[PDB]
Design a binder for this molecule. Structure first.
Ligand SMILES: Cn1ncc(C(=O)N2CCOCC2)c1C(=O)Nc1ccn2cc(-c3ccccc3)nc2c1
Ligand SMILES: [Mg+2]
Ligand SMILES: [Zn+2]
Length: 313
């Protein structure tokens, strides 16, 4: 009960900032996550024994892939922590509980391959889940872990509160399908500009939570340039392995996944920042003004990729 988690001073301070990097010490990440749950949600919202056992089962169900791994899960949870702590009063008690867990679980059992590769390979998961294939899998894996003996961190919630939190988690995890992001952001942009945006409207909150999930998921673009650049290497390690596997199916991969077109990465980053990242953090800042540091960091990194092309690095 009176057992707090305490980080060393540099982490205690920097964990509050959007651009925090959780570091290379894997064994500190569970404690970093519990710290964030305790400060974001309260020391009472989960039984520590049940939370610790849930965290370690989630960790075990992430694979040893270059990018879609346990570090990504905790990284995405930290960005959500930073958003929630900078928007104290905008979110319900159940939303705070559900969203940190959603972020931890959002890529559970990722194989390092896109929905598109699963469909072209004809993976069983593509037959079970026709759209948002991996994201429906990630939610299914989250529910499976919640149902292990002594893993139900939501046990002390009412039947109503329990169905609500699992509903928040399902929507949040599905929203991490970037194919769904484009239409979600357009609708939010329309609603904000016509002044029809209403945070008491559940379907409006759902859309705002969805954009938060995209923002947290893409948060490598909001880090210090060396973190952004080094994270990009892990992203391309997976893209290019998928491209290799496309070539094995006798399919020319898109340039993004073709290690032969390594040369064009800088321009591909510009397209990504302009088409996906900048619009995401722009709309998020309009709806939630205190998330502006994410947009500022993203713009700083866009400027770094522009310097790479101009041969200044
Ligand atoms: C930084 N960041 N963060 C998350 C993601 C991301 O999208 N994820 C979804 C898939 O799962 C990984 C995260 C990225 C990213 O680099 N995106 C992209 C997106 C589109 N591109 C086109 C090219 C490219 C084109 C031509 C030649 C060479 C490269 N390169 C890119 C990188
Ligand atoms: Mg994902
Ligand atoms: Zn992810």
């Amino acid at each position: 009960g009176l057992m707090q988690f305490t980080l060393p001073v540099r982490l205690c301070k920097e964990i509050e900032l959007f651009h925090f990097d959780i570091g290379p010490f894997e064994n500190m990440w569970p404690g970093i996550f519990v710290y964030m749950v305790h400060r974001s949600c309260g020391t009472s919202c989960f039984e520590l024994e049940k939370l610790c056992r849930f965290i370690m089962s989630v960790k075990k169900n992430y694979r040893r892939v270059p990018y879609h791994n346990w570090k990504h899960a905790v990284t995405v949870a930290h960005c959500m922590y930073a958003i929630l702590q900078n928007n104290h009063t905008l979110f319900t008690d159940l939303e705070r509980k559900g969203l940190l867990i959603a972020c931890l679980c959002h890529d559970l059992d990722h194989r390092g391959f896109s929905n598109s590769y699963l469909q072209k390979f004809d993976h069983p998961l593509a037959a079970l889940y026709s759209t948002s294939t991996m994201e429906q899998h990630h939610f299914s894996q989250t529910v499976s872990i919640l149902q292990l003996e002594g893993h139900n961190i939501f046990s002390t919630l009412s039947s109503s509160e329990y169905e609500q939190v699992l509903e928040i988690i399902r929507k949040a995890i599905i929203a991490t399908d970037l194919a769904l992001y484009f239409g979600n952001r357009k609708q939010l942009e329309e609603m904000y500009q016509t002044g029809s945006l209403n945070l008491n409207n559940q379907s409006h909150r759902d859309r705002v939570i969805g954009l938060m999930m995209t923002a947290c998921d893409l948060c490598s673009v909001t880090k210090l340039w060396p973190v952004t650049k080094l994270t990009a290497n892990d992203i391309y390690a997976e893209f290019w392995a998928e491209g290799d596997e496309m070539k094995k199916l006798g399919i020319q991969p898109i340039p993004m996944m073709d290690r032969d077109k390594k040369d064009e990465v800088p321009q591909g980053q510009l397209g990504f920042y302009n088409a996906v990242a900048i619009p995401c953090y722009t709309t998020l800042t309009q709806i939630l003004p205190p998330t502006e540091p994410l947009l500022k960091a993203c713009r700083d990194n866009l400027s770094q990729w522009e310097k790479v092309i101009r041969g200044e690095e």
